[PDB]
Design a binder for these strands. Structure first.
Ligand SMILES: Nc1ncnc2c1ncn2[C@H]1C[C@H](O)[C@@H](COP(=O)(O)OP(=O)(O)OP(=O)(O)O)O1
Ligand SMILES: [Mn+2]
Ligand SMILES: [Mn+2]
Length: 425
DNA sequence: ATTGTGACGCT
DNA sequence: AGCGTCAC
């Protein structure tokens, strides 16, 4: 009823760079622009593993996780850019530094939560109030929303439809009510157009975005119209949108929890969750998950945009699959040193840029025969940014996992070093 | 023989 | 603390 909180208090956007690693390589190498092309890691096994794919290449069926040899079967003219190799492993520095370029621009407009290397949430609530006060009642022109889709419109050529839906939306707006959530979302979308224009002018990178009242809806919205477009998902659009939305498409429901929601309740679509009481959902999925589901299927989520532009952890990982598994102590020591040297480089740079020091070193490994991705995770003190010391300490901490009696058994299929627990410096 | 990350929850 | 889930 009237006391029914509608979860319409905030304006939240999710900005995601289109095929980000590919764009980084296309900026650097103009020969790759506007072409089917992908970014690959390594090159020996089946041509390398594809980790990013241009939209031209996606049209042929090329996807992430595909081997390059197989992608070339689908797309014989596919162009490839290789991830840099340093110290025997893939090194993602070029893409981290490009991400920082973009995040720094986004931070001029509003508070950002770095959600991954290529995407960030934006809390636009205060920016919208400021922009509304600056407007003082004038209507919002379609010209201010040149790449915006209004989800669910029009109702009652793709660009033609986009413009029809946008006109229907803007005609319907009550511009004189500064408290209308729909108006607030629209102004948020204006600001996000400006943000996206700034990113493209100052980096060359294009991105898509979602604008809604919370992070889950903003992330869902972002994927509705890609690439190089943005989508506004209003509170009112939620019943129709969710009525045919597979549960696995909502952030955090793509895994075993979503599968159990489907199996236990006997439903397929997000909207079907509205038929259950909060207590019913809590009984199946726990107190937190149940309350979250009960609100989220109504379009309501309260998870804040956290003020956090930097990663909380700095990690270095390598898999050693099949016959590359490590079977000698020297092999284990040498790779621990390689990882620790990349970690030391990145940490020293982080301490200089961001005025902080890590204090905990996490060491994880995967043993051949383990079906788990991580077999053992142990922590030690990180007291100095010294690669030899970090590697000696990781060895000291994992050494009792060798069940042999110079050899290493069972052979190691993964090494992982992660610097955590940062404190101001 | 998806790899290399990175955030967060549970107990 | 160590392990598990989820998504890029
Ligand atoms: N499994 C992975 N392994 C390594 N890198 C990955 C993996 N998944 C995603 N990435 C990298 C490459 C991507 O360019 C970057 C951003 O991821 P993501 O937003 O999901 O897709 P994308 O930016 O490549 O295309 P788009 O967002 O337009 O669909 O992170
Ligand atoms: Mn992306
Ligand atoms: Mn992304």
């Amino acid at each position: 009823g009237p006391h029914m909180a509608t979860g319409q208090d905030r304006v939240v956007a999710l900005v995601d760079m289109d095929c980000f690693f590919v764009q980084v390589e296309q900026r650097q190498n103009p020969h790759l622009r506007n072409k089917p092309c992908a970014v690959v890691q390594y090159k020996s096994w089946k041509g390398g593993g594809i980790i990013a794919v241009s939209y031209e290449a996606r049209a042929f069926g090329v996807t992430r996780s595909m081997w390059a040899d197989d992608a070339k079967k689908l797309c014989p003219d596919l162009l490839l850019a290789q991830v840099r190799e340093s110290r025997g492993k893939a090194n993602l520095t070029k893409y981290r530094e490009a991400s920082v370029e973009v995040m720094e621009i986004m931070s001029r407009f509003a508070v950002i939560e770095r959600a991954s290397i290529d995407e960030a949430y934006v809390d636009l609530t205060s920016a919208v109030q400021e922009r509304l006060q600056k407007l003082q009642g004038q209507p919002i022109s379609a010209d201010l929303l040149p790449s915006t889709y209004i989800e669910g419109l029009p109702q009652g050529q793709k660009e033609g439809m986009r413009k029809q839906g946008l006109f229907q939306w803007l005609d319907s707006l009550q511009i004189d009510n500064l408290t209308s959530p729909d108006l607030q979302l629209t102004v948020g979308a204006v600001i996000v157009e400006e943000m996206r224009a700034a990113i493209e002018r100052e980096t060359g990178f294009q991105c898509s975005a979602g604008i809604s009242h919370n992070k889950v809806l903003a992330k869902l919205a972002c994927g509705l119209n890609k690439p190089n477009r943005q989508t506004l998902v209003s509170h009112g659009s939620v019943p129709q949108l969710f009525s045919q939305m597979p549960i696995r498409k909502i952030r955090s429901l793509g895994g075993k929890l979503g599968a159990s929601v489907i199996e236990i309740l006997g439903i397929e679509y997000m909207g079907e969750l509205t038929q259950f009481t909060e207590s019913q959902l809590q009984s199946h999925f726990g107190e937190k998950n149940g309350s979250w589901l009960y609100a989220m299927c109504r379009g309501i989520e309260h998870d804040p945009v956290k003020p956090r532009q930097l990663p909380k952890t700095i990690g270095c990982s390598k898999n050693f699959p099949g016959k590359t598994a490590l079977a000698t102590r020297e092999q284990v020591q040498w790779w621990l040193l390689q990882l620790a040297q990349e970690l030391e480089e990145r940490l020293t740079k982080d301490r200089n840029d961001n005025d902080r020091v890590a204090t905990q070193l996490v060491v994880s490994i995967r043993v051949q025969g383990d079906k788990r991705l991580s077999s053992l995770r142990r922590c030690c003190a990180l007291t100095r940014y010294d690669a030899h010391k970090m590697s000696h300490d990781a060895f000291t901490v994992i050494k009792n996992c060798n069940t042999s009696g110079t050899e290493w058994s069972p052979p190691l299929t993964m090494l992982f070093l992660c610097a955590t627990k940062f404190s101001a410096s």
